[PDB]
Amino acid sequence: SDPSSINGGIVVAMTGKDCVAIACDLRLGSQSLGVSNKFEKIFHYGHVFLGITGLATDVTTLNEMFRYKTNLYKLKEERAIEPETFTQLVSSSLYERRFGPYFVGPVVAGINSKSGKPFIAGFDLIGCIDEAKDFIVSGTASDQLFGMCESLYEPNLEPEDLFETISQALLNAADRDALSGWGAVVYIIKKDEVVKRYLKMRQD
Template sequence: MVTTDFQKIFPMGERLYIGLAGLATDVQTVAQRLKFRLNLYELKEGRQIKPQTFMSMVSNLLYERRFGPYYTEPVIAGLDPVTHEPFICSLDLIGCPMITDDFVVSGTCSEQMYGMCESLWEPDMEPDHLFETISQAMLNAVDRDALSGMGVVVHVIEKDKITTRTLKARMD
């Protein structure tokens, strides 16, 4: 049985998400192990985790398996629970982080996305404009890469709300 709606984005906190591109079994394993470690952290510390700390947790999990890595490329996006500062980064298979202020791409269609993201991205976009930009870049990449799936789920994280929209792409 083949599914076209495999979950690749996982909520890890109130304003913290991780996207995992890669081998389906490794995606599920990494998501479950991270949720376990995150629950332990929050029980021990008694507070929500900061995105930078979560990035270190993900990096450690991946680096532990560097000789037999999980085939996933994580992307972490979220807001700091106290300052509401945005945070976005990506990691490679062995946990090396790439922190940036603008955008990151990951997965089978990453080559197609770089050009679109570089041309469409602007600093300090409003949430609606950001959604349109993300949607255009993602749908363009998905249309050019059959392995990426049949649609896109876009999460726009704001200080007071999270907007989630599903976009359908062509199925051929």
């Protein structure tokens, strides 16, 4: 009944030293029934990464919408959109459906190509921006993620250390949520290289 917990799933993003990381589980379900273990919730438009949790039809719809909008942005601006600018676009786009909203929990992650500054942001379903320095969490196991991130996180982690921290935050949070899991992906993002790792986790 609650649209934000029909399909399940989680996304988490962290900042490190000259890097950012964004991760998600791979589950899609119809309440108790597991339907897909390949439903990735992280997308990217150039060097800007977007994770989306919530109702899966809206996740897919919003990805297609932001691809649409960032493609036109690029054609007109003659440059790729930046994390800070894209964050405002997501907020704008969500609030324009204020009284018929998309049931989602987006998370932006990326590095500004000019300043080199790491950036993350989170939103509620109608566009309110949470611009945290440390970490952003979203999904059916957001409480669990807040608990993991709050204790495991420390600032200025190197890329390869940040990977372990965010991976362990996601994994252990997902294992305490019935509607999350069935696989996981972690993106480690640097100014001009991005690595994507699929994690091994329990499949129940």
